[PDB]
Structure formats: structure tokens, C-alpha cells
């Protein structure tokens, strides 16, 4: 019924929220590394 709904098996997925811990991995640097150009907000150079 409607009070009991199951999704398709293997269809759904959580999402990675970075910067929200220290033991989740993506924390205190959010998966960019240390200093540089492409660890700045909006860095990373044009492709090609």
C-alpha cells in the first residue's frame, strides 16, 4: 500500500556532503588537497 513503499533494489544512493566532519574523510579540506590554484573557490583552469 501507501503506508509502506519500497524503492527499486539498487536504484537509490546517498550523496556526499563535504566539509561536515573529520572522520567522514571529506573534512577540513573537502577533497581538494592543500594550497594551489585549483584548491581556491572557483579556481581550476579552462579545459584544453
Amino acid at each position: 500500500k501507501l503506508h509502506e513503499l519500497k524503492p527499486a533494489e539498487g536504484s537509490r544512493k546517498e550523496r556526499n556532503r563535504v566539509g561536515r566532519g573529520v572522520a567522514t574523510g571529506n573534512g577540513k579540506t573537502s577533497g581538494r588537497g592543500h594550497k594551489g590554484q585549483k584548491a581556491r573557490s572557483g579556481g581550476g583552469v579552462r579545459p584544453g
Binding site: 573529520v22 572522520a23 573534512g27 577540513k28
Partner: protein, 100 residues
């Protein structure tokens, strides 16, 4: 008299009417257990004294089986992001000695 039993990889000096920590055995409560491996049995006058003496067995009677107190295991390292945190309850077995 007294006698030395070997229970959980270690040795316990026990006499009579005595209650003990022993690490976990395979018995239910209210049962009876038998230690077929005794080492130095005898007080002042009673002596055998032998390498793993044969013939004498020591009985027991199980009062309860449960778990010890929770020992929280924390470990961090400074300047870094490393940590761990666990918790542990080592299961024991309480006995009561009836005969040597």
C-alpha cells in the same frame, strides 16, 4: 589445603568455598564443571608437587555468566585528523569451588 588450577591460559590459586573470575567456558548456569589439570595441590602436610600431576580433579559450580564493565578505547594523534573510538565488554564466568 589449596590447589592451582589452569583455566583460561593462566593459573589461579584457589582453596574452597571460593568465587572467581574465569574467562568464558561452555556451560549453562546451575551446571557443574571439572578441572582435569591441576598443578600443585596440597597445603602444609598434604604434598604431591609434580609436573602436571595426575589423579586429582577439582570441581566447580557455575553461578552466572555475563559481561564485564565497558572499557572505552580511545586513541588520537596530534596535529593530524586521526582518531578511533571503540568499546569492549570481556565475557567472564563465575564459579564456586566444591571439592579438591
Amino acid at each position: 589445603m589449596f590447589a592451582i588450577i589452569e583455566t583460561g591460559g593462566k593459573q589461579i590459586k584457589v582453596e574452597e568455598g571460593q568465587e572467581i573470575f574465569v574467562e568464558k567456558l561452555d556451560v549453562n548456569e546451575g551446571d557443574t564443571f571439572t578441572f582435569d589439570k591441576v598443578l600443585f595441590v596440597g597445603g602444609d602436610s598434604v604434598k604431591v608437587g609434580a609436573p602436571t600431576v595426575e589423579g586429582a580433579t577439582v570441581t566447580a559450580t557455575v553461578n552466572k555468566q555475563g559481561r564485564g564493565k565497558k572499557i572505552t578505547v580511545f586513541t588520537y594523534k596530534r596535529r593530524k585528523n586521526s582518531k578511533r573510538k571503540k568499546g569492549h565488554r570481556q565475557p567472564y564466568t563465575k564459579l564456586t569451588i566444591d571439592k579438591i
